[PDB]
Amino acid sequence: SNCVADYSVLYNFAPFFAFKCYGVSPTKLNDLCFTNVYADSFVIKGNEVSQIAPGQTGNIADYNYKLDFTGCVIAWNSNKLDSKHSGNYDYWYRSLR
Amino acid sequence: QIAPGQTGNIADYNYKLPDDFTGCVIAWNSNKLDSKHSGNYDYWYRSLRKSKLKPFERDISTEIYQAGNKPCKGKGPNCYFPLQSYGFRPTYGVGHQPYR
Amino acid sequence: TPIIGRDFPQGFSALEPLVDLPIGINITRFQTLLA
Amino acid sequence: NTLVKQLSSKFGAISSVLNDILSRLDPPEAEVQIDRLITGRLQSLQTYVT
Ligand SMILES: *[C@@H]1O[C@H](CO)[C@@H](O[C@@H]2O[C@H](CO)[C@@H](O)[C@H](O)[C@H]2NC(C)=O)[C@H](O)[C@H]1NC(C)=O
């Protein structure tokens, strides 16, 4: 509904260190939206990013939620938000499960 | 994807099989002599390419793929290595195991 | 093709296949080699 | 007018327009649907000529 699915803005939003995606493609031509894309957003440790992969377990992706899915992520730490050592818990997930 | 007319990361960027094709595709499970516990990363496939491949063409290169619009060199926000390694292991399900 | 030493007769002839070399590469340019 | 009208028929195909068949289906499936439309259209021409 007035969605379009223009993904060039997400790509341009911030640089990536690596794509760290499990489904890289042009992702349509940004004129038309197809399928319900959805966005399950959370923040995890650099080793946990690799742990959440198709068919992978580790500690994460067994606790919380398992990943058939597209992993395209803007792989950039929001240093302006995570600059404090005490931080916040705005991105929490049930890592204990 | 190893069939006439298929689409996917292999059919399009690693090996296009002809649509008018005569021959046999023989496949078997190979967890033995592969899929070491520490991860067998000797096998690579291409995931990023400029265009789709023609039947039986083998373009073997390490040219860095430019995903974005701004030029870059080697490694950077728009520069990605074109090949993706895959670590085969005994713990992966059937769809994620190596086949010979 | 045996031809007269200089002038072309502009006659008709045809070539026969000799080899299929499946190099499997993209060919866009070529050059000759001097001995 | 009948011969032209027959071009809008499907003869069992997913669509009477060839560009939709190539856009929606993988090459070998498009070829099957195209042969189906070819059969229907050539049968229409043979009927017209007869
Ligand atoms: C074979 O080589 C030619 C030239 O090296 C390739 O043509 C280029 O393709 C890219 C990607 O589409 C274009 O951006 C360039 O402009 C093309 N070059 C020219 C001169 O037009 C061609 O794609 C290669 N074949 C394959 C199958 O990759």
PDB file of C-alpha atoms and ligand atoms in Angstrom:
ATOM      1  CA  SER A   1       0.000   0.000   0.000  1.00  0.00           C
ATOM      2  CA  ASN A   2       2.039   2.957  -1.303  1.00  0.00           C
ATOM      3  CA  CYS A   3       5.084   0.747  -0.687  1.00  0.00           C
ATOM      4  CA  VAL A   4       6.987   0.642  -4.048  1.00  0.00           C
ATOM      5  CA  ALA A   5       9.881  -1.366  -2.480  1.00  0.00           C
ATOM      6  CA  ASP A   6      12.625   1.016  -3.580  1.00  0.00           C
ATOM      7  CA  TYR A   7      15.786  -0.537  -2.124  1.00  0.00           C
ATOM      8  CA  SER A   8      18.282   2.001  -3.457  1.00  0.00           C
ATOM      9  CA  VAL A   9      17.581   4.260  -0.476  1.00  0.00           C
ATOM     10  CA  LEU A  10      18.469   1.466   1.943  1.00  0.00           C
ATOM     11  CA  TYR A  11      21.706   0.749   0.090  1.00  0.00           C
ATOM     12  CA  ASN A  12      22.607   4.457  -0.042  1.00  0.00           C
ATOM     13  CA  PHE A  13      21.567   5.031   3.601  1.00  0.00           C
ATOM     14  CA  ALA A  14      24.916   3.854   4.977  1.00  0.00           C
ATOM     15  CA  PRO A  15      28.099   2.080   3.824  1.00  0.00           C
ATOM     16  CA  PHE A  16      28.495  -1.629   4.528  1.00  0.00           C
ATOM     17  CA  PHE A  17      31.614  -3.318   5.870  1.00  0.00           C
ATOM     18  CA  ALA A  18      30.474  -6.449   4.009  1.00  0.00           C
ATOM     19  CA  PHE A  19      27.005  -7.176   2.695  1.00  0.00           C
ATOM     20  CA  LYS A  20      26.551 -10.197   5.013  1.00  0.00           C
ATOM     21  CA  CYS A  21      23.479 -11.277   3.038  1.00  0.00           C
ATOM     22  CA  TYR A  22      22.099 -14.739   2.254  1.00  0.00           C
ATOM     23  CA  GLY A  23      20.160 -13.594  -0.834  1.00  0.00           C
ATOM     24  CA  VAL A  24      22.003 -10.889  -2.781  1.00  0.00           C
ATOM     25  CA  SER A  25      20.318  -9.729  -5.976  1.00  0.00           C
ATOM     26  CA  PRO A  26      19.331  -6.393  -7.559  1.00  0.00           C
ATOM     27  CA  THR A  27      16.095  -6.999  -5.598  1.00  0.00           C
ATOM     28  CA  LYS A  28      13.635  -5.899  -8.279  1.00  0.00           C
ATOM     29  CA  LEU A  29      13.924  -2.621 -10.221  1.00  0.00           C
ATOM     30  CA  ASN A  30      12.485  -0.392  -7.418  1.00  0.00           C
ATOM     31  CA  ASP A  31       9.380   0.524  -9.455  1.00  0.00           C
ATOM     32  CA  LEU A  32       7.054  -2.231  -8.180  1.00  0.00           C
ATOM     33  CA  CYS A  33       6.694  -4.054  -4.857  1.00  0.00           C
ATOM     34  CA  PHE A  34       6.212  -7.828  -4.817  1.00  0.00           C
ATOM     35  CA  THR A  35       5.525 -10.155  -1.870  1.00  0.00           C
ATOM     36  CA  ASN A  36       5.270  -9.097   1.787  1.00  0.00           C
ATOM     37  CA  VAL A  37       8.893  -8.163   2.443  1.00  0.00           C
ATOM     38  CA  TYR A  38       8.703  -7.659   6.248  1.00  0.00           C
ATOM     39  CA  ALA A  39      11.648  -6.458   8.368  1.00  0.00           C
ATOM     40  CA  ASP A  40      12.660  -8.334  11.541  1.00  0.00           C
ATOM     41  CA  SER A  41      15.094  -5.791  13.065  1.00  0.00           C
ATOM     42  CA  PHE A  42      17.417  -6.347  16.057  1.00  0.00           C
ATOM     43  CA  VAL A  43      21.087  -5.644  16.970  1.00  0.00           C
ATOM     44  CA  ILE A  44      23.590  -8.456  17.674  1.00  0.00           C
ATOM     45  CA  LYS A  45      27.314  -9.069  18.169  1.00  0.00           C
ATOM     46  CA  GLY A  46      29.584  -9.395  15.134  1.00  0.00           C
ATOM     47  CA  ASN A  47      29.991 -13.133  15.741  1.00  0.00           C
ATOM     48  CA  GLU A  48      26.249 -13.565  16.159  1.00  0.00           C
ATOM     49  CA  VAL A  49      25.692 -12.083  12.693  1.00  0.00           C
ATOM     50  CA  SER A  50      27.558 -15.085  11.299  1.00  0.00           C
ATOM     51  CA  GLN A  51      25.761 -17.435  13.693  1.00  0.00           C
ATOM     52  CA  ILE A  52      22.353 -16.485  12.210  1.00  0.00           C
ATOM     53  CA  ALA A  53      22.660 -18.215   8.832  1.00  0.00           C
ATOM     54  CA  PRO A  54      20.615 -20.819   6.933  1.00  0.00           C
ATOM     55  CA  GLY A  55      21.071 -24.202   8.570  1.00  0.00           C
ATOM     56  CA  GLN A  56      23.364 -22.761  11.277  1.00  0.00           C
ATOM     57  CA  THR A  57      22.961 -23.017  15.054  1.00  0.00           C
ATOM     58  CA  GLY A  58      25.550 -21.592  17.465  1.00  0.00           C
ATOM     59  CA  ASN A  59      24.195 -19.921  20.593  1.00  0.00           C
ATOM     60  CA  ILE A  60      22.040 -17.383  18.776  1.00  0.00           C
ATOM     61  CA  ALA A  61      19.525 -18.708  16.194  1.00  0.00           C
ATOM     62  CA  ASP A  62      18.738 -21.471  18.716  1.00  0.00           C
ATOM     63  CA  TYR A  63      17.718 -19.023  21.394  1.00  0.00           C
ATOM     64  CA  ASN A  64      15.429 -16.212  20.234  1.00  0.00           C
ATOM     65  CA  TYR A  65      14.359 -16.956  16.611  1.00  0.00           C
ATOM     66  CA  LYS A  66      15.644 -19.308  13.884  1.00  0.00           C
ATOM     67  CA  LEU A  67      16.382 -17.975  10.411  1.00  0.00           C
ATOM     68  CA  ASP A  68      14.705 -19.609   2.873  1.00  0.00           C
ATOM     69  CA  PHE A  69      15.197 -16.052   4.199  1.00  0.00           C
ATOM     70  CA  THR A  70      17.052 -13.086   2.717  1.00  0.00           C
ATOM     71  CA  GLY A  71      19.805 -11.816   5.007  1.00  0.00           C
ATOM     72  CA  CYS A  72      20.444  -8.482   3.300  1.00  0.00           C
ATOM     73  CA  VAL A  73      21.486  -6.152   6.097  1.00  0.00           C
ATOM     74  CA  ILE A  74      23.032  -2.694   6.216  1.00  0.00           C
ATOM     75  CA  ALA A  75      26.124  -4.067   7.968  1.00  0.00           C
ATOM     76  CA  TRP A  76      27.162  -0.910   9.775  1.00  0.00           C
ATOM     77  CA  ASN A  77      27.403  -0.320  13.501  1.00  0.00           C
ATOM     78  CA  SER A  78      25.368   2.658  14.703  1.00  0.00           C
ATOM     79  CA  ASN A  79      28.329   4.025  16.647  1.00  0.00           C
ATOM     80  CA  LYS A  80      26.398   7.229  17.383  1.00  0.00           C
ATOM     81  CA  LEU A  81      23.836   5.104  19.284  1.00  0.00           C
ATOM     82  CA  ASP A  82      26.162   2.490  20.861  1.00  0.00           C
ATOM     83  CA  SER A  83      28.866   4.961  21.985  1.00  0.00           C
ATOM     84  CA  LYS A  84      27.988   4.592  25.695  1.00  0.00           C
ATOM     85  CA  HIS A  85      29.256   1.624  27.681  1.00  0.00           C
ATOM     86  CA  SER A  86      25.999   1.367  29.642  1.00  0.00           C
ATOM     87  CA  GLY A  87      23.952   1.990  26.505  1.00  0.00           C
ATOM     88  CA  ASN A  88      20.293   0.996  26.456  1.00  0.00           C
ATOM     89  CA  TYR A  89      18.175  -2.101  25.763  1.00  0.00           C
ATOM     90  CA  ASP A  90      16.108  -0.651  22.913  1.00  0.00           C
ATOM     91  CA  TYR A  91      17.054  -3.584  20.624  1.00  0.00           C
ATOM     92  CA  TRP A  92      16.651  -6.408  23.154  1.00  0.00           C
ATOM     93  CA  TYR A  93      15.744  -9.961  22.160  1.00  0.00           C
ATOM     94  CA  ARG A  94      15.285 -13.100  24.257  1.00  0.00           C
ATOM     95  CA  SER A  95      18.852 -14.376  24.072  1.00  0.00           C
ATOM     96  CA  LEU A  96      18.195 -16.588  27.127  1.00  0.00           C
ATOM     97  CA  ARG A  97      15.566 -18.933  25.492  1.00  0.00           C
TER      98      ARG A  97
ATOM     99  CA  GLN B   1      19.285 -25.749 -10.957  1.00  0.00           C
ATOM    100  CA  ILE B   2      21.313 -28.149 -13.159  1.00  0.00           C
ATOM    101  CA  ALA B   3      18.557 -28.521 -15.727  1.00  0.00           C
ATOM    102  CA  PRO B   4      17.528 -26.752 -18.939  1.00  0.00           C
ATOM    103  CA  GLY B   5      15.705 -23.489 -18.375  1.00  0.00           C
ATOM    104  CA  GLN B   6      16.506 -23.021 -14.681  1.00  0.00           C
ATOM    105  CA  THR B   7      17.107 -19.743 -12.845  1.00  0.00           C
ATOM    106  CA  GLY B   8      19.156 -19.230  -9.695  1.00  0.00           C
ATOM    107  CA  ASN B   9      22.582 -18.264  -8.484  1.00  0.00           C
ATOM    108  CA  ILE B  10      24.170 -21.259 -10.229  1.00  0.00           C
ATOM    109  CA  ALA B  11      22.046 -21.437 -13.362  1.00  0.00           C
ATOM    110  CA  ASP B  12      22.630 -17.703 -13.967  1.00  0.00           C
ATOM    111  CA  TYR B  13      26.094 -16.855 -12.507  1.00  0.00           C
ATOM    112  CA  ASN B  14      28.076 -20.129 -12.364  1.00  0.00           C
ATOM    113  CA  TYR B  15      26.829 -22.440 -15.140  1.00  0.00           C
ATOM    114  CA  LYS B  16      24.012 -21.976 -17.623  1.00  0.00           C
ATOM    115  CA  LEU B  17      22.867 -25.301 -19.090  1.00  0.00           C
ATOM    116  CA  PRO B  18      21.418 -25.207 -22.654  1.00  0.00           C
ATOM    117  CA  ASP B  19      17.691 -25.219 -23.176  1.00  0.00           C
ATOM    118  CA  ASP B  20      18.136 -27.682 -26.061  1.00  0.00           C
ATOM    119  CA  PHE B  21      20.156 -30.208 -24.047  1.00  0.00           C
ATOM    120  CA  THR B  22      21.040 -33.863 -24.574  1.00  0.00           C
ATOM    121  CA  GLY B  23      22.904 -35.635 -21.788  1.00  0.00           C
ATOM    122  CA  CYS B  24      22.675 -36.939 -18.234  1.00  0.00           C
ATOM    123  CA  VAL B  25      22.905 -35.161 -14.872  1.00  0.00           C
ATOM    124  CA  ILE B  26      24.230 -37.651 -12.301  1.00  0.00           C
ATOM    125  CA  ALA B  27      24.203 -36.645  -8.632  1.00  0.00           C
ATOM    126  CA  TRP B  28      24.955 -38.263  -5.298  1.00  0.00           C
ATOM    127  CA  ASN B  29      25.367 -37.251  -1.650  1.00  0.00           C
ATOM    128  CA  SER B  30      29.004 -36.691  -0.639  1.00  0.00           C
ATOM    129  CA  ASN B  31      29.228 -35.906   3.060  1.00  0.00           C
ATOM    130  CA  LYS B  32      32.006 -38.510   3.158  1.00  0.00           C
ATOM    131  CA  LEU B  33      35.366 -37.165   1.917  1.00  0.00           C
ATOM    132  CA  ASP B  34      33.932 -33.654   2.411  1.00  0.00           C
ATOM    133  CA  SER B  35      32.130 -31.570   5.051  1.00  0.00           C
ATOM    134  CA  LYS B  36      34.846 -31.607   7.697  1.00  0.00           C
ATOM    135  CA  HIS B  37      33.798 -30.666  11.232  1.00  0.00           C
ATOM    136  CA  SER B  38      35.791 -27.415  11.189  1.00  0.00           C
ATOM    137  CA  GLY B  39      34.089 -26.365   7.931  1.00  0.00           C
ATOM    138  CA  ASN B  40      35.214 -27.282   4.420  1.00  0.00           C
ATOM    139  CA  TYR B  41      35.800 -23.891   2.783  1.00  0.00           C
ATOM    140  CA  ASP B  42      37.712 -25.164  -0.264  1.00  0.00           C
ATOM    141  CA  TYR B  43      34.545 -24.925  -2.398  1.00  0.00           C
ATOM    142  CA  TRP B  44      33.367 -21.553  -3.726  1.00  0.00           C
ATOM    143  CA  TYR B  45      30.565 -20.377  -5.984  1.00  0.00           C
ATOM    144  CA  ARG B  46      29.889 -17.043  -7.642  1.00  0.00           C
ATOM    145  CA  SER B  47      27.047 -14.956  -6.206  1.00  0.00           C
ATOM    146  CA  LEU B  48      27.744 -11.542  -7.786  1.00  0.00           C
ATOM    147  CA  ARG B  49      28.088 -11.123 -11.533  1.00  0.00           C
ATOM    148  CA  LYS B  50      27.537  -8.335 -14.064  1.00  0.00           C
ATOM    149  CA  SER B  51      25.297 -10.427 -16.347  1.00  0.00           C
ATOM    150  CA  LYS B  52      23.836 -13.892 -16.782  1.00  0.00           C
ATOM    151  CA  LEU B  53      25.990 -16.614 -18.290  1.00  0.00           C
ATOM    152  CA  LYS B  54      25.659 -18.259 -21.710  1.00  0.00           C
ATOM    153  CA  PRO B  55      25.493 -22.063 -21.991  1.00  0.00           C
ATOM    154  CA  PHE B  56      28.708 -23.816 -20.834  1.00  0.00           C
ATOM    155  CA  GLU B  57      30.739 -20.551 -20.449  1.00  0.00           C
ATOM    156  CA  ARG B  58      33.279 -20.656 -17.544  1.00  0.00           C
ATOM    157  CA  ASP B  59      34.301 -17.059 -16.611  1.00  0.00           C
ATOM    158  CA  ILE B  60      36.898 -17.581 -13.860  1.00  0.00           C
ATOM    159  CA  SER B  61      37.970 -14.299 -12.294  1.00  0.00           C
ATOM    160  CA  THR B  62      38.346 -12.475  -8.981  1.00  0.00           C
ATOM    161  CA  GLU B  63      37.279  -9.036 -10.267  1.00  0.00           C
ATOM    162  CA  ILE B  64      35.742  -7.073  -7.419  1.00  0.00           C
ATOM    163  CA  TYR B  65      32.021  -6.541  -7.972  1.00  0.00           C
ATOM    164  CA  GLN B  66      30.696  -2.984  -7.725  1.00  0.00           C
ATOM    165  CA  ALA B  67      27.269  -3.214  -6.098  1.00  0.00           C
ATOM    166  CA  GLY B  68      26.655   0.524  -5.755  1.00  0.00           C
ATOM    167  CA  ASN B  69      26.815   3.504  -8.079  1.00  0.00           C
ATOM    168  CA  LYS B  70      29.878   5.245  -6.615  1.00  0.00           C
ATOM    169  CA  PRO B  71      33.188   3.819  -7.972  1.00  0.00           C
ATOM    170  CA  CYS B  72      35.475   2.009  -5.529  1.00  0.00           C
ATOM    171  CA  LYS B  73      38.534  -0.260  -5.678  1.00  0.00           C
ATOM    172  CA  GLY B  74      39.426  -3.530  -3.957  1.00  0.00           C
ATOM    173  CA  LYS B  75      37.224  -3.442  -0.866  1.00  0.00           C
ATOM    174  CA  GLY B  76      34.736  -0.879   0.362  1.00  0.00           C
ATOM    175  CA  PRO B  77      31.106   0.200   0.813  1.00  0.00           C
ATOM    176  CA  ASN B  78      30.322  -0.697  -2.820  1.00  0.00           C
ATOM    177  CA  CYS B  79      33.094  -3.287  -3.415  1.00  0.00           C
ATOM    178  CA  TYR B  80      32.401  -6.963  -2.677  1.00  0.00           C
ATOM    179  CA  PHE B  81      34.388 -10.077  -3.546  1.00  0.00           C
ATOM    180  CA  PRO B  82      32.410 -11.889  -6.300  1.00  0.00           C
ATOM    181  CA  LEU B  83      32.772 -15.411  -4.876  1.00  0.00           C
ATOM    182  CA  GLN B  84      31.128 -16.820  -1.764  1.00  0.00           C
ATOM    183  CA  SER B  85      32.729 -19.732   0.033  1.00  0.00           C
ATOM    184  CA  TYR B  86      30.555 -22.265   1.812  1.00  0.00           C
ATOM    185  CA  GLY B  87      31.667 -24.230   4.840  1.00  0.00           C
ATOM    186  CA  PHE B  88      30.295 -27.760   4.517  1.00  0.00           C
ATOM    187  CA  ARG B  89      29.816 -29.554   7.834  1.00  0.00           C
ATOM    188  CA  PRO B  90      28.251 -32.829   9.061  1.00  0.00           C
ATOM    189  CA  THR B  91      25.667 -30.829  11.077  1.00  0.00           C
ATOM    190  CA  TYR B  92      23.855 -29.264   8.102  1.00  0.00           C
ATOM    191  CA  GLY B  93      20.571 -30.621   6.813  1.00  0.00           C
ATOM    192  CA  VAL B  94      20.212 -32.454   3.523  1.00  0.00           C
ATOM    193  CA  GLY B  95      19.568 -29.317   1.479  1.00  0.00           C
ATOM    194  CA  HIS B  96      22.806 -27.769   2.826  1.00  0.00           C
ATOM    195  CA  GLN B  97      25.118 -30.823   2.426  1.00  0.00           C
ATOM    196  CA  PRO B  98      27.657 -31.257  -0.396  1.00  0.00           C
ATOM    197  CA  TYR B  99      26.841 -33.325  -3.455  1.00  0.00           C
ATOM    198  CA  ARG B 100      29.241 -34.724  -6.072  1.00  0.00           C
TER     199      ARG B 100
ATOM    200  CA  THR C   1      43.245 -23.645 -52.842  1.00  0.00           C
ATOM    201  CA  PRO C   2      45.607 -23.737 -55.863  1.00  0.00           C
ATOM    202  CA  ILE C   3      45.307 -20.351 -57.602  1.00  0.00           C
ATOM    203  CA  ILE C   4      47.149 -18.536 -60.381  1.00  0.00           C
ATOM    204  CA  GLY C   5      50.197 -16.789 -58.906  1.00  0.00           C
ATOM    205  CA  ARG C   6      48.672 -13.293 -58.597  1.00  0.00           C
ATOM    206  CA  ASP C   7      45.219 -12.524 -60.020  1.00  0.00           C
ATOM    207  CA  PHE C   8      42.118 -13.933 -58.406  1.00  0.00           C
ATOM    208  CA  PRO C   9      39.965 -16.013 -60.803  1.00  0.00           C
ATOM    209  CA  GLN C  10      37.031 -15.268 -58.464  1.00  0.00           C
ATOM    210  CA  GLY C  11      35.791 -18.819 -58.909  1.00  0.00           C
ATOM    211  CA  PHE C  12      33.827 -21.007 -56.523  1.00  0.00           C
ATOM    212  CA  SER C  13      35.299 -23.305 -53.867  1.00  0.00           C
ATOM    213  CA  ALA C  14      34.372 -24.526 -50.395  1.00  0.00           C
ATOM    214  CA  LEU C  15      36.058 -25.283 -47.073  1.00  0.00           C
ATOM    215  CA  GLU C  16      35.796 -28.465 -44.968  1.00  0.00           C
ATOM    216  CA  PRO C  17      35.542 -28.715 -41.144  1.00  0.00           C
ATOM    217  CA  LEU C  18      38.696 -29.795 -39.322  1.00  0.00           C
ATOM    218  CA  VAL C  19      38.411 -29.301 -35.549  1.00  0.00           C
ATOM    219  CA  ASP C  20      36.141 -28.369 -32.623  1.00  0.00           C
ATOM    220  CA  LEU C  21      38.243 -26.816 -29.810  1.00  0.00           C
ATOM    221  CA  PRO C  22      35.893 -26.236 -26.791  1.00  0.00           C
ATOM    222  CA  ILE C  23      37.848 -23.416 -25.150  1.00  0.00           C
ATOM    223  CA  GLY C  24      34.682 -22.199 -23.427  1.00  0.00           C
ATOM    224  CA  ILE C  25      35.661 -18.506 -23.211  1.00  0.00           C
ATOM    225  CA  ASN C  26      34.365 -15.087 -24.243  1.00  0.00           C
ATOM    226  CA  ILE C  27      36.132 -14.093 -27.488  1.00  0.00           C
ATOM    227  CA  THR C  28      35.770 -10.448 -28.551  1.00  0.00           C
ATOM    228  CA  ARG C  29      39.151  -9.546 -30.123  1.00  0.00           C
ATOM    229  CA  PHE C  30      41.924 -11.297 -32.038  1.00  0.00           C
ATOM    230  CA  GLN C  31      45.343 -10.738 -33.602  1.00  0.00           C
ATOM    231  CA  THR C  32      47.751 -12.631 -35.866  1.00  0.00           C
ATOM    232  CA  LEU C  33      51.247 -13.900 -34.888  1.00  0.00           C
ATOM    233  CA  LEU C  34      54.537 -13.212 -36.658  1.00  0.00           C
ATOM    234  CA  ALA C  35      57.170 -15.930 -37.029  1.00  0.00           C
TER     235      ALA C  35
ATOM    236  CA  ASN D   1     -12.606 -10.712 -39.029  1.00  0.00           C
ATOM    237  CA  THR D   2     -12.932 -14.273 -37.737  1.00  0.00           C
ATOM    238  CA  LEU D   3      -9.301 -15.028 -38.532  1.00  0.00           C
ATOM    239  CA  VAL D   4      -8.175 -11.908 -36.679  1.00  0.00           C
ATOM    240  CA  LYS D   5     -10.551 -12.616 -33.768  1.00  0.00           C
ATOM    241  CA  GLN D   6      -8.954 -16.050 -33.327  1.00  0.00           C
ATOM    242  CA  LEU D   7      -5.704 -14.349 -32.276  1.00  0.00           C
ATOM    243  CA  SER D   8      -7.330 -13.472 -28.930  1.00  0.00           C
ATOM    244  CA  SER D   9      -8.061 -17.139 -28.157  1.00  0.00           C
ATOM    245  CA  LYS D  10      -5.847 -19.159 -25.821  1.00  0.00           C
ATOM    246  CA  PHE D  11      -6.375 -22.746 -27.052  1.00  0.00           C
ATOM    247  CA  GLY D  12      -5.543 -23.881 -23.501  1.00  0.00           C
ATOM    248  CA  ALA D  13      -2.638 -21.450 -23.051  1.00  0.00           C
ATOM    249  CA  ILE D  14      -2.317 -19.253 -19.976  1.00  0.00           C
ATOM    250  CA  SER D  15      -2.636 -16.190 -22.214  1.00  0.00           C
ATOM    251  CA  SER D  16      -3.246 -15.398 -25.877  1.00  0.00           C
ATOM    252  CA  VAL D  17      -0.402 -12.814 -25.876  1.00  0.00           C
ATOM    253  CA  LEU D  18       3.077 -14.281 -26.399  1.00  0.00           C
ATOM    254  CA  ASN D  19       4.870 -11.611 -24.359  1.00  0.00           C
ATOM    255  CA  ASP D  20       2.968 -12.640 -21.242  1.00  0.00           C
ATOM    256  CA  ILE D  21       4.023 -16.255 -21.756  1.00  0.00           C
ATOM    257  CA  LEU D  22       7.700 -15.321 -22.078  1.00  0.00           C
ATOM    258  CA  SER D  23       7.505 -12.913 -19.122  1.00  0.00           C
ATOM    259  CA  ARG D  24       5.706 -15.291 -16.730  1.00  0.00           C
ATOM    260  CA  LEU D  25       7.205 -18.722 -17.588  1.00  0.00           C
ATOM    261  CA  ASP D  26      10.636 -20.322 -17.642  1.00  0.00           C
ATOM    262  CA  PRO D  27      11.880 -20.874 -21.281  1.00  0.00           C
ATOM    263  CA  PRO D  28      10.845 -24.568 -21.636  1.00  0.00           C
ATOM    264  CA  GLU D  29       7.386 -23.877 -20.222  1.00  0.00           C
ATOM    265  CA  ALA D  30       7.049 -20.855 -22.444  1.00  0.00           C
ATOM    266  CA  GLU D  31       7.972 -23.096 -25.366  1.00  0.00           C
ATOM    267  CA  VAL D  32       5.191 -25.532 -24.455  1.00  0.00           C
ATOM    268  CA  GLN D  33       2.604 -22.731 -24.249  1.00  0.00           C
ATOM    269  CA  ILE D  34       3.926 -21.207 -27.482  1.00  0.00           C
ATOM    270  CA  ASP D  35       3.597 -24.512 -29.340  1.00  0.00           C
ATOM    271  CA  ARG D  36       0.014 -24.626 -28.076  1.00  0.00           C
ATOM    272  CA  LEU D  37      -0.728 -21.152 -29.464  1.00  0.00           C
ATOM    273  CA  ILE D  38       1.125 -21.981 -32.694  1.00  0.00           C
ATOM    274  CA  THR D  39      -1.028 -25.059 -33.202  1.00  0.00           C
ATOM    275  CA  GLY D  40      -4.218 -23.082 -32.646  1.00  0.00           C
ATOM    276  CA  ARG D  41      -3.176 -20.222 -34.930  1.00  0.00           C
ATOM    277  CA  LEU D  42      -1.959 -22.430 -37.770  1.00  0.00           C
ATOM    278  CA  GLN D  43      -5.149 -24.467 -37.533  1.00  0.00           C
ATOM    279  CA  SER D  44      -7.044 -21.188 -37.865  1.00  0.00           C
ATOM    280  CA  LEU D  45      -5.078 -20.301 -40.995  1.00  0.00           C
ATOM    281  CA  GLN D  46      -5.639 -23.731 -42.537  1.00  0.00           C
ATOM    282  CA  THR D  47      -9.358 -23.376 -41.888  1.00  0.00           C
ATOM    283  CA  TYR D  48      -9.347 -19.928 -43.500  1.00  0.00           C
ATOM    284  CA  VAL D  49      -7.413 -21.088 -46.578  1.00  0.00           C
ATOM    285  CA  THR D  50      -9.567 -24.205 -47.009  1.00  0.00           C
TER     286      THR D  50
HETATM  287  C1  LIG E   1      32.371 -10.600 -23.325  1.00  0.00           C
HETATM  288  O1  LIG E   1      33.212  -9.432 -23.272  1.00  0.00           O
HETATM  289  C2  LIG E   1      32.535  -8.210 -23.612  1.00  0.00           C
HETATM  290  C3  LIG E   1      33.574  -7.114 -23.570  1.00  0.00           C
HETATM  291  O2  LIG E   1      34.599  -7.410 -22.631  1.00  0.00           O
HETATM  292  C4  LIG E   1      31.380  -7.973 -22.640  1.00  0.00           C
HETATM  293  O3  LIG E   1      30.678  -6.800 -23.033  1.00  0.00           O
HETATM  294  C5  LIG E   1      30.519  -5.875 -21.938  1.00  0.00           C
HETATM  295  O4  LIG E   1      29.469  -6.273 -21.028  1.00  0.00           O
HETATM  296  C6  LIG E   1      29.255  -5.365 -19.932  1.00  0.00           C
HETATM  297  C7  LIG E   1      28.159  -5.959 -19.080  1.00  0.00           C
HETATM  298  O5  LIG E   1      26.940  -6.069 -19.804  1.00  0.00           O
HETATM  299  C8  LIG E   1      28.905  -3.981 -20.475  1.00  0.00           C
HETATM  300  O6  LIG E   1      28.747  -3.075 -19.388  1.00  0.00           O
HETATM  301  C9  LIG E   1      30.013  -3.504 -21.400  1.00  0.00           C
HETATM  302  O7  LIG E   1      29.681  -2.232 -21.945  1.00  0.00           O
HETATM  303  C10 LIG E   1      30.192  -4.508 -22.527  1.00  0.00           C
HETATM  304  N1  LIG E   1      31.236  -4.070 -23.440  1.00  0.00           N
HETATM  305  C11 LIG E   1      30.990  -3.469 -24.610  1.00  0.00           C
HETATM  306  C12 LIG E   1      32.193  -3.090 -25.419  1.00  0.00           C
HETATM  307  O8  LIG E   1      29.848  -3.239 -24.998  1.00  0.00           O
HETATM  308  C13 LIG E   1      30.442  -9.171 -22.682  1.00  0.00           C
HETATM  309  O9  LIG E   1      29.387  -8.995 -21.744  1.00  0.00           O
HETATM  310  C14 LIG E   1      31.217 -10.436 -22.346  1.00  0.00           C
HETATM  311  N2  LIG E   1      30.342 -11.597 -22.368  1.00  0.00           N
HETATM  312  C15 LIG E   1      29.824 -12.151 -21.265  1.00  0.00           C
HETATM  313  C16 LIG E   1      28.947 -13.347 -21.482  1.00  0.00           C
HETATM  314  O10 LIG E   1      30.049 -11.705 -20.144  1.00  0.00           O
END
